Amino acid sequence: TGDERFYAEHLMPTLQGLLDPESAHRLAVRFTSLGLLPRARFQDSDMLEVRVLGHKFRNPVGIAAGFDKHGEAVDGLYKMGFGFVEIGSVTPKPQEGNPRPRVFRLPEDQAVINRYGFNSHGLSVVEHRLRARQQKQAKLTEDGLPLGVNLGKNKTSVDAAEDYAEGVRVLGPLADYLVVNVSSPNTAGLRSLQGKAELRRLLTKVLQERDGLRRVHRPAVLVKIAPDLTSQDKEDIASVVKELGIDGLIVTNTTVSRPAGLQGALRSETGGLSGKPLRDLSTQTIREMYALTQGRVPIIGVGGVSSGQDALEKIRAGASLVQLYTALTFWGPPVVGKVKRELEALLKEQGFGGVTDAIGADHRR
Amino acid sequence: TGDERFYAEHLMPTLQGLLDPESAHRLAVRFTSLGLLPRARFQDSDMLEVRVLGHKFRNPVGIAAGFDKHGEAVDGLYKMGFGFVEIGSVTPKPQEGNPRPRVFRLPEDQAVINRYGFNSHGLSVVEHRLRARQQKQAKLTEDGLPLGVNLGKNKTSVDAAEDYAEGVRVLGPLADYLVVNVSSPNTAGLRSLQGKAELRRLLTKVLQERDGLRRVHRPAVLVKIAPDLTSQDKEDIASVVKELGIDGLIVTNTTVSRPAGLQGALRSETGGLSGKPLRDLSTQTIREMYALTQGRVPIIGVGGVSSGQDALEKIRAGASLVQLYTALTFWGPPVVGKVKRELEALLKEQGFGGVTDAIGADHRR
Ligand SMILES: Cc1cc2nc3c(=O)[nH]c(=O)nc-3n(C[C@H](O)[C@H](O)[C@H](O)COP(=O)(O)O)c2cc1C
Ligand SMILES: Cc1cc2nc3c(=O)[nH]c(=O)nc-3n(C[C@H](O)[C@H](O)[C@H](O)COP(=O)(O)O)c2cc1C
Ligand SMILES: CC[C@@H](C)c1ccc(-c2nc3ccc(Br)cc3c(C(=O)O)c2C)cc1
Ligand SMILES: CC[C@@H](C)c1ccc(-c2nc3ccc(Br)cc3c(C(=O)O)c2C)cc1
Ligand SMILES: CCCCCCCCCCC[N+](C)(C)[O-]
Ligand SMILES: CCCCCCCCCCC[N+](C)(C)[O-]
Ligand SMILES: O=C(O)c1cc(=O)[nH]c(=O)[nH]1
Ligand SMILES: O=C(O)c1cc(=O)[nH]c(=O)[nH]1
């Protein structure tokens, strides 16, 4: 907590004052991958353990996709205290993404707007990087620290479904779960894959490919959705998920909306908005998807989590696990232990024996 | 905290299971007014004290209008640990309000929908009730526990401005601050008084009447606004407030919106929605009004506050004081001490010397 205060009040604001956010991002990935951070002090208690998606998670707090896009910092992220790590999005071929600048801080809103556009080292590079530590990961996974891989589509792809199928074939065998990212606001036409008929065709193909993998190399498949869906869109997704036996949902990606009240000078930049202004939009989307799937489909809740209260609100709304990203950029590494310690305190205060007991609790009130 | 858990987990859910919400409301007012609650244990520290609106507030946590509509429970509310009490809305003549049922719980959303329609004992009854304890209130106020009076308009009023003027004349001399409630979603035509030209005419008249009161009986005047305003509406309110020297704003009343994701069976009932689903809508409205008024106009922040984090988010967005109501209905009296204790902890954790230092802090980031 002295550490928490030092990072939040001194170190992070200073780094943000010195570097543009993309440079700071690159440096953070480098520092994390070199293990230069001291190992997090918080010791995960048994009440934080969750069993879902065919795996044990030592704690329910993960790092969201987009921080480690290319799988370079996975071990340093576990060292920070994350219960699970998701890398990506990874596209089949390497691609540069959008021209710079393409990421913007909104400090007054504790938010970020990004339009990276799936900058990716590509499947082949990431495959080799993961293969180099594959057995180390197998041990981590067995110890309750799973790895997720988030798949995207190349900008010039003439067949979206084949892009995702290729990712299943190449990175599926290296992942505990795969995410079909059909919700980036930064690749033209992508979010239209959330529509009923596309989504059914796409996910049938993804699931066929996944089912074709050898048993020990067969990941769970999750779909990551936008916070900007119509009620019709959400009903349709819920129906397809149940029809096909999709293993879970990630709720939500960034928003293309700009909520009333944003103060940052850069609020009108094109891109997806993340952080505090997204928080309750995400929570409400979790609540809706949990109800539509009858609580039978595991949800990873993401968007604006920066405290134990934020985490518990998403868990009570229906999330089995949560992720954060934007909070790390403002508060630094100590935010992980902060969220975990506050979550444990609140679980006890509200009479929950553990995280598992709190999942979807608001729906039973 | 054992008390907190008993109320939240046992007592309150049991009362809610036994009584319709209007009956429970009536019983709560009666019990509070009889002092039947034990006096709250939390001792207000100096870091919670705020000086604003020409008064000292021992702590920044108030009870919002609509709980004690007729000024029957003011002393019992201070006993609960509220730093200030707001009664009302009070209409010039007595009126029954809407037919029953007119209030609805949404337990799955931690929300309420109400359409009371300004049920009021009227000015004359409330005047006598306040006069009976006027000197007791003068001492409370001097000790840092001010009283606000919220004014409404009768359903059949042929002249809204004169309704508010009458309230200023009759209850102004008994109040530390008055609130011109132009934001009830439950009286036809009322919210149109938020428009620039009406509002200017109305508030000029209110301020003239207030200025006509003797110095020691001259209250601050605040305007309470909706969370459903357009950007144009908010710009216009900010402009009128500065043009006329209005003393403060109360942000916000209940919403006529129904955010995506509401789960309660009663979500489609007509009325204003309060509680958790309103929280971030309110916070964003505070953020916007603070910026539009350059931080020079005190804001009382209200909508979905049930924790110290909720309170601090509104303070950092620009609120000098906060109020709650809906949280009390789910968590009971211990929620007041809970909010205060958590707020104090968070202020220390974030390096604020006191509440005053945190006011509008997000705008300086
Ligand atoms: C800079 C940045 C890059 C991102 N890249 C990706 C990505 O490649 N794939 C993806 O599925 N989500 C991506 N996201 C979205 C996050 O995974 C997460 O859904 C979103 O930011 C909400 O969480 P937060 O508010 O905690 O940041 C990115 C977010 C940010 C801020
Ligand atoms: C049952 C009920 C009655 C209310 N009556 C009034 C009222 O008479 N005047 C008023 O200005 N606001 C009234 N409100 C609004 C509250 O003062 C407050 O602005 C709103 O409920 C948001 O706060 P909360 O989420 O903490 O309840 C009422 C709210 C509720 C739930
Ligand atoms: C790994 C070192 C710690 C101290 C660290 C953590 C996060 C950051 C950081 N990461 C970002 C990632 C993505 C984006 Br977009 C922005 C950042 C920023 C930033 O806001 O500049 C920071 C500081 C920098 C350093
Ligand atoms: C004053 C006694 C304490 C224990 C108490 C506090 C609040 C309530 C209460 N107040 C309400 C006020 C307005 C509305 Br609308 C509803 C309530 C409810 C309720 O949800 O039924 C309660 C329980 C009941 C008892
Ligand atoms: C036309 C060239 C396409 C190759 C794309 C390059 C890989 C993506 C760039 C990510 C940034 N990087 C970490 C390499 O510096
Ligand atoms: C036509 C009769 C108008 C008189 C209105 C009565 C006062 C408002 C009712 C509030 C409920 N009460 C607390 C009295 O039971
Ligand atoms: O690469 C990006 O632009 C990106 C992808 C994504 O899924 N979400 C996001 O906010 N940005
Ligand atoms: O009496 C009511 O109906 C009422 C008034 C008000 O200002 N706000 C509200 O939600 N209800």
Q: Give the 3-state DSSP-derived string for A217-250, with helices as H, strands as E and coil as C.
A: HCCEEEEEECCCCCHHHHHHHHHHHHHHCCCEEE
Q: Are strands A103-106 and A111-114 parallel, antiparallel or unpaired?
A: antiparallel
In degrees and rounded to multiples of 5, residue B213 shows phi and psi of -80, 150
Please give the structure tokens belonging to residue B144.
Answer: 């840092």
* Other residues' Cβ atoms within 10 Å of the Cβ of residue B173: 17
Q: What is the DSSP letter of A361?
A: G
Alpha helices in chain B (DSSP H): 2-6, 12-18, 21-33, 74-79, 123-131, 134-142, 160-171, 196-211, 231-244, 279-292, 308-317, 326-331, 334-349, 355-358
Nearest to B227 by CA among B264, B184, B282: B282
Best mutation site among B274, B283, B329, B335 for ligand 2 pocket (most ligand atoms within 8 Å of CB): B274
Q: State the Cα–Cα distance between residues A177 and A164, nearest whole angstrom.
A: 14
Please give the structure tokens belonging to residue A141.
Answer: 């996974």
Q: Are strands B55-57 and B50-52 parallel, antiparallel or unpaired?
A: antiparallel
Q: State the Cα–Cα distance between residues B205 and B193, nearest whole angstrom.
A: 13
In the three-class reduction of DSSP (H, G, I as helix; E, B as strand; rest coil), residue A53 is classed as coil
From residue A299, alpha-carbon distances to A282, B167, B299 in Å are 12, 52, 38
Please give the structure tokens belonging to residue A248.
Answer: 């879970």
Q: State the Cα–Cα distance between residues B247 and B53, nearest whole angstrom.
A: 7
B307–A263 C-beta distance less than 8 A:
no
| Partner residues linked to B84 by β-bridges | B62
Residue in this structure with the two tokens 């906060």, named with its chain if needed: B322
Q: Taken in order B303, B107, B67, B168, is the CA torsion positive or negative?
A: positive
Helix A196-211 / helix A231-244 crossing angle, nearest 10 deg: 30
Radius of gyration, alpha carbons of chain B: 19
What burial class does residue B269 get, using C-beta atoms within 10 Å of its C-beta: 0-12 exposed, 13-18 middle, 19+ buried?
A: middle
Query: What's the B295 CA to ligand 8 centre distance in angstroms?
Result: 27
- Tell me which of B23, B124, B157, B184 is the catalytic residue: B184
Answer whether the bond into residue B252 is a cis peptide, omega within 30°: yes
Please give the structure tokens belonging to residue A27.
Answer: 């440096």
| Contact assessment for residue A267 and residue A109, using Cβ atoms and an 8 Å cutoff | yes
Q: Which residues line ligand 7 (CB under 6 A)?
A: A 66, 89, 114-118, 181, 184, 186, 253-254, 272
The type of residue at A252 is T
Closest ligand 8 atom to Cα of B69? 1
Domains defined along chain B, listed by start: 1-365 (3.20.20.70)
What burial class does residue B257 get, using C-beta atoms within 10 Å of its C-beta: 0-12 exposed, 13-18 middle, 19+ buried?
A: middle
Please give the structure tokens belonging to residue B23.
Answer: 């009956």
Q: Taken in order B304, B308, B310, B316, is the CA torsion positive or negative?
A: positive
Q: State the Cα–Cα distance between residues B210 and B178, nearest whole angstrom.
A: 9
Nearest to B110 by CA among B300, B285, B307: B307
| Contact assessment for residue A150 and residue A65, using Cβ atoms and an 8 Å cutoff | yes
Alpha-carbon dihedral of residues A26, A28, A32, A38, nearest 10 degrees? 160
In the three-class reduction of DSSP (H, G, I as helix; E, B as strand; rest coil), residue A298 is classed as coil
Best mutation site among B249, B325, B336 for ligand 2 pocket (most ligand atoms within 8 Å of CB): B325
Nearest to A53 by CA among A286, A232, A321, A302: A321
Q: Which residues in chain B touch residue A4, judged by CB atoms under 8 angstroms apart? A: 349
Q: What is the DSSP letter of A11?
A: I
Q: Which of residues 315-354 of A touch B (CB under 8 A)?
A: 349-351
Q: State the Cα–Cα distance between residues A263 and B291, nearest whole angstrom.
A: 8
**From B5, B110, B279, residue closest to A351, measured CB to CB:** B5
A9–B362 C-beta distance less than 8 A:
no
Best mutation site among A3, A10, A25, A37 for ligand 3 pocket (most ligand atoms within 8 Å of CB): A25
Express the helix, strand and coil content of chain A in percent, nearest 5 each.
45, 15, 35
Ligand 2 in contact with B303 (CB < 6 A)? yes
Q: Are strands A61-63 and A321-324 parallel, antiparallel or unpaired?
A: parallel
**Contacts of A44 by beta carbon, 8 Å cutoff, 6+ apart:** A58, A59, A81, A83, A340
| Contact assessment for residue B193 and residue B149, using Cβ atoms and an 8 Å cutoff | no
Shortest Cα distance from A318 to chain B (angstroms)?
12
Shortest Cα distance from A278 to chain B (angstroms)?
10
| Nearest ligand to residue B115 Cα | 8
| Partner residues linked to A86 by β-bridges | A148
Please give the structure tokens belonging to residue B84.
Answer: 């200030």
Q: How many CA atoms lie within 13 A of B218 on its CB side?
A: 12
User: What distance separates the 2 farthest-apart alpha carbons in chain A?
Assistant: 53
**Contacts of A271 by beta carbon, 8 Å cutoff, 6+ apart:** A102, A103, A104, A113, A114, A115, A185, A186, A254
Q: How many CA atoms lie within 13 A of B363 on its CB side?
A: 23
* Other residues' Cβ atoms within 10 Å of the Cβ of residue B279: 24
Residue in this structure with the two tokens 């079909």, named with its chain if needed: A180
In degrees and rounded to multiples of 5, residue A237 shows phi and psi of -65, -45
Nearest to A90 by CA among A133, A126, A134: A126
B280–A108 C-beta distance less than 8 A:
no
In the three-class reduction of DSSP (H, G, I as helix; E, B as strand; rest coil), residue B229 is classed as coil
Residue in this structure with the two tokens 């930049």, named with its chain if needed: A269
What burial class does residue B122 get, using C-beta atoms within 10 Å of its C-beta: 0-12 exposed, 13-18 middle, 19+ buried?
A: middle
Q: How far apart are the first and last CA of chain B?
A: 34
Q: State the Cα–Cα distance between residues A39 and A46, nearest whole angstrom.
A: 20
Q: How many CA atoms lie within 13 A of B161 on its CB side?
A: 13
Please give the structure tokens belonging to residue B22.
Answer: 């209007």
Q: State the Cα–Cα distance between residues A174 and A172, nearest whole angstrom.
A: 5
Residue in this structure with the two tokens 């009108």, named with its chain if needed: A268
In degrees and rounded to multiples of 5, residue B189 shows phi and psi of 80, -10
Radius of gyration, alpha carbons of chain A: 19
The residue whose CA is least distant from atom 9 of ligand 5 is A96
| Contact assessment for residue B191 and residue B184, using Cβ atoms and an 8 Å cutoff | yes
Q: State the Cα–Cα distance between residues A133 and A73, nearest whole angstrom.
A: 11
Resolution of this structure in Å: 1.9
Q: State the Cα–Cα distance between residues B283 and B360, nearest whole angstrom.
A: 12
Helix B279-292 / helix B231-244 crossing angle, nearest 10 deg: 50
A307–B108 C-beta distance less than 8 A:
no
Number of residue pairs across A and B with CB atoms under 8 Å? Answer: 74
In degrees and rounded to multiples of 5, residue A235 shows phi and psi of -60, -45
Please give the structure tokens belonging to residue B70.
Answer: 């007729």
In the three-class reduction of DSSP (H, G, I as helix; E, B as strand; rest coil), residue A22 is classed as helix
The residue whose CA is least distant from atom 15 of ligand 1 is A253
The per-residue DSSP string of B89-131 comes to EE-SS-B--SPSP-EEEEGGGTEEEE-----B--HHHHHHHHH
Question: Reading across the β-sheet that carries A272-275, which strands appear in turn?
Answer: A103-106, A111-114, A272-275
Q: State the Cα–Cα distance between residues B112 and B64, nearest whole angstrom.
A: 14
Count of residues making up chain B: 365
Q: How many CA atoms lie within 13 A of A69 on its CB side?
A: 20
The residue whose CA is least distant from atom 13 of ligand 1 is A66
Question: Reading across the β-sheet that carries B111-114, which strands appear in turn?
Answer: B103-106, B111-114, B272-275
**Contacts of B20 by beta carbon, 8 Å cutoff, 6+ apart:** B101
Q: State the Cα–Cα distance between residues B60 and B355, nearest whole angstrom.
A: 8
Q: Which of residues 240-299 of A touch B (CB under 8 A)?
A: 259-263, 277, 279-280, 283-288, 291
Ligand 3 in contact with A298 (CB < 6 A)? no
Q: Which residues in chain B touch residue A277, judged by CB atoms under 8 angstroms apart? A: 280, 284
Closest ligand 3 atom to Cα of A328? 7
Count of residues making up chain A: 365
Q: State the Cα–Cα distance between residues A69 and A79, nearest whole angstrom.
A: 18
| Contact assessment for residue B250 and residue B179, using Cβ atoms and an 8 Å cutoff | yes
Nearest to B211 by CA among B198, B202, B220, B222: B220
Answer whether the bond into residue B101 is a cis peptide, omega within 30°: yes
Please give the structure tokens belonging to residue A91.
Answer: 């596209």
Shortest Cα distance from A136 to chain B (angstroms)?
37
Q: How many CA atoms lie within 13 A of B117 on its CB side?
A: 13
* Other residues' Cβ atoms within 10 Å of the Cβ of residue B141: 16
Please give the structure tokens belonging to residue A191.
Answer: 């979010």
The per-residue DSSP string of A174-202 comes to G-SEEEEE---TTSTTGGGGGSHHHHHHH
From residue B140, alpha-carbon distances to B76, B84, B89, B148, B252 in Å are 13, 10, 22, 12, 26
| Contact assessment for residue B111 and residue B263, using Cβ atoms and an 8 Å cutoff | no
The C-alpha angle with vertex A292 and arms to A291 and A294, in degrees rounded to 5, equals 60
Which pairs from A27-30 meet CB under 8 Å and 24+ separation? Answer: A28/A67, A29/A67, A29/A68, A29/A72, A29/A73
Nearest to B350 by CA among B303, B315, B298: B315
Q: How far apart are the first and last CA of chain A?
A: 34
Distance of CA B20 to the CA centre of its chain: 23
Q: What is the DSSP letter of B255?
A: B
**Contacts of B178 by beta carbon, 8 Å cutoff, 6+ apart:** B148, B149, B150, B151, B167, B168, B171, B172, B206, B210, B219, B220, B221, B222
Q: Which helix (H) or strand (E) holds A52?
A: strand A50-52
Shortest Cα distance from A356 to chain B (angstroms)?
18
Q: Taken in order B187, B189, B193, B195, is the CA torsion positive or negative?
A: positive
Nearest to B191 by CA among B132, B222, B158, B237: B237
| B184 in catalytic set | yes
Provide the total of helices (H) and of strands (E) in chain A, helices listed first: 14, 13
